[PDB]
Amino acid sequence: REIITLQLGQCGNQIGFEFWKQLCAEHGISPEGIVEEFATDRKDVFFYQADDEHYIPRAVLLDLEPRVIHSILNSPYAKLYNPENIYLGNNWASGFSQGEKIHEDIFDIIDREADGSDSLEGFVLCHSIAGGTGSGLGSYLLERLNDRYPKKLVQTYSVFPNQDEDVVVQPYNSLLTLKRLTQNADCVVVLDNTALNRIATDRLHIQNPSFSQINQLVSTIMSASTTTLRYPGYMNNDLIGLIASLIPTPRLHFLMTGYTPLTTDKTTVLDVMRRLLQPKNVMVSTNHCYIAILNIIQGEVDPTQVHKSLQRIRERKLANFIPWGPASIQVALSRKSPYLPSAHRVSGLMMANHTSISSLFERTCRQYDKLRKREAFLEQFRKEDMFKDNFDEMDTSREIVQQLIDEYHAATRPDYISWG
Amino acid sequence: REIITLQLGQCGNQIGFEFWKQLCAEHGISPEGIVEEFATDRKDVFFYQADDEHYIPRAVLLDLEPRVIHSILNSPYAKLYNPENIYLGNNWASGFSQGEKIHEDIFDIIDREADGSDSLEGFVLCHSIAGGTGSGLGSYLLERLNDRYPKKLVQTYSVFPNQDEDVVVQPYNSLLTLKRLTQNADCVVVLDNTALNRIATDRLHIQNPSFSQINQLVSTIMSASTTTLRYPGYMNNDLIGLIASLIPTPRLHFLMTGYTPLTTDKTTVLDVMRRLLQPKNVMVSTNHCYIAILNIIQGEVDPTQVHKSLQRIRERKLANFIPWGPASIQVALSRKSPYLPSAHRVSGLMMANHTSISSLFERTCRQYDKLRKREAFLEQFRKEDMFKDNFDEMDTSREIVQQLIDEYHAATRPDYISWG
Amino acid sequence: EYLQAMRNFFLDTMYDFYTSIFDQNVSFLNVQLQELDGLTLSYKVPWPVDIVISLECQKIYNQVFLLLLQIKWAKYSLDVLLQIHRMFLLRVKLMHFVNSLHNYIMTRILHSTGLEFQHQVEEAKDLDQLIKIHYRYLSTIHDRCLLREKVSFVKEAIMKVLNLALMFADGWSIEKMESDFKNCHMFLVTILNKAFPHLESLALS
Amino acid sequence: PPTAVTEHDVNVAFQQSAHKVLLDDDNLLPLLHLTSGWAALGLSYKVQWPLHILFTPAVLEKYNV
Prior knowledge:
Chains A, B: InterPro entries: Gamma_tubulin, Tub_FtsZ_C, Tubulin, Tubulin/FtsZ-like_C, Tubulin/FtsZ_2-layer-sand-dom, Tubulin/FtsZ_GTPase_sf, Tubulin_C, Tubulin_CS. Helices cover 43% and strands 13% of the residues of chain A. Chain A is α/β, with parallel strands linked by helices and 420 residues long. Chain A is globular. The longest helix of chain C is centred in the middle third of the chain and has 24 residues, at 86-109. With 65 residues, chain D is mostly helical. Helix content of chain D is 32%, strand content 0%. Chain D is built from 2 helices and no strands. Chain B binds chain C through residues 186, 234-235, 237-238, 240-241, 243-245, 247-250, 303-304, 306-307, 310-311, 314, 324-328, 330-331, 416-419, and chain C through 12, 15, 78-82, 85-86, 88-89, 91-93, 95-97, 99-100, 103, 106-108, 111-112, 115, 200-201, 204-205.
């Protein structure tokens, strides 16, 4: 059903605008919203059911001090959506306080779009971890949505920040935002800028327009994640049916992503299964076994050979898995999307709950603990000081992520029949 | 039956002359009045039944200091009508006093046309709110008709003035004229120059010949409002049967208008129903629900799918409505008018009694109250001072429009079973 | 030409004809024509058209003509006007329902089926089949607009609300009308929710 | 089911569910019928019988199960 998309921060507004351009080019949509002469499919997931099928995206843009929003403005895709839901520092404290002072009218924008919608099923946050203006503001405002609407689902698209540390409060910003992602969000998809830049230098020799290329990558990711909804498929036409298979524990909602064609410039399903089982098709960088793996595929397949593919991949025993419990690898299939150029016809995408991300969390834990012991990298924000005199919110987040690391490592153990 | 049309003021004479050109081009009429070789339909609503069907319009032009009347003169459509019913400042007091001194001979022109007519059913006033020479004179003379003929219907075509305040007595002029519209008129259709200019800048990039374009718009409005009469339809061939459905309260006679094709440079009836249910097809700019909505349509329709359209729009429940009482949306259909070019074959027009106009009234109330408290924007007219030493006519009108605002807001309440 | 004139110059033009008598006699009808009960009308069909259009067909036309005149009676009596304030509620409360009933009879039956019926009679290739396709419209248009069906469980409300258009016209008490009106209205809505299909247009209103 | 009231209700609800998106008209062949109401669930359907004897009553009951 009806899901309202949230874009915020410089990075989040970038991939949100790119993804809306992707869905405008993808379906039979003009740059004005007009249904084209080649448009059928399910068109009410983010698309406003207008009379002449002006499929207006449910896209709420809220930031302050607009820079990239001007670049969004001089475009014909500012005529695709505008139900007047577009709204005009880089620290957690500054963004937090700026979100505090104007929370009411932007939440009125939220409420107007909410009652204007037929239903509400999820909040999709276009974001990046410590995204400058996105950080602080997004954690605050995410707390406002989670308090104000406890009956909805939260998926947060963000990337792991790698800017080669310059802001020195970035582990604090990511730590507090990660606390809010634990307690005010039900799904967080994070990706490594390092591994994506490695794949970009792998397939081609371009790494310099990294923003533009990464918009293509995560726009392919998000269109592939919603393709079973936006084109008539069979299952995971709800977000919640997709989320339920991944999560055995509502604090372990952090998923690894991989994509089977690394070049775009076909063959059977067993082959792409073996490809995706390799960790070099993964977009993300002791012993770690997955909790549950699920794959979406789109392309030209043999409908009987997918049975044979699962049969051979099983009897190969090409993976490990976790001691505690019967899960599986899970196959999901949908159509190859029409009305775009179709190169490398099989494109697969994987969502897996892996314990390897606890090491990445521990890296940020060690960075935060190091800068905390040194205590010269908070820069004494007055907004942070009046917000928290003792800075024990960071201590509480470090406690939360440590409890999650403990849950990760006891889930690696067969004693997750007992407590983790 | 027979309705005599009144055009007065610069604006009212403009759209009246344009509308008479519209009906001359519309029916089989020469610029001399001669019935043409393509002329059947009902031709006695404003058309004098001459022998050789010189369908002379019942058009009474009365003003003083003629400027635009000279532009009406050098035209072949001055030979369409002239039964000698054409007669040769911008304030309410000046126009009021000028209408006072010559009321007798122009009322003799009225009486001569009245007994010359077979019957009398309505006065259609071509006007604009605070139309300069129209204001004051029109309120005075409207009082003369309402006193002199209490058995007739008054419809006043006017537009809400937006000239970006320069005359500073304009809220006083509109306030007194609005008092006369409450107590000496039974129907007032007002339109926002702001929203019409917004639609003009929306469909095209022209806003500079705004007078010429707005003549086309309100001439389409008025021809569409009278099309069921001037072409053989079934119902609302009386004005009063049309007016009766809109009005539950004889002081709430102010109607909102919308028009379904916004471009002219077709499809089913459910679609235009959904279009007209959107507030962007409306020509006019807390919670506000309509009292009663009625629509006229002209075009190529399926006569069974209009049932299906009302069925689907009802079961959609795409609208709210008012607590107190069983009203409905009301469909009305007539022919698409022949002998003109027929582009965008479905053209719909809506009349609705909405409580949102009370906010517009309150805007003018706040403007009048502000200029009254400042008391430097009446300019001390001596005609106004001898007409009213204490200027309590404006106080009484403000009382009247406040009572109407109270009726509007208690009609928003379910307690309009009790008094409003 | 006669068939087109039938449904357009009776069953408008005849509205004013009825309204002049509304505010009598057998000679008044003729001078008004040449300018809620009773009311004959007389006209002759020529013999080449009388061996297609029956004599009994006039008796069928009279039945529907009477009922439509009663609708115009109640409609025109309420198209002259625009606890103490309770009368205005009784205005909205009734004007609704009479417009719904009128919309039903006019649009849903007499404009759908008649427009199809002209398109069907042009597909008759002879004299005799033209009689048959006509009669298979007559005996069902005589049924669709209520003249033989649910005569005292739906139709009686239409009968009793016609006098409310007179009682409410006089006053131009009030609560003692709406208590009766909402009860018979609710009987009608709770019967029509199971409905032949063309009654669902006013089942909802 | 009382089997005189619910039969109308299932079809009314079904077409109203269909009106929200995707075939608000065109293809009225499926109509929810009734013979718990899940264990008394039926359906009404129609195919062109002279032009489809591939579908029979037997073939469509097999699909219905």
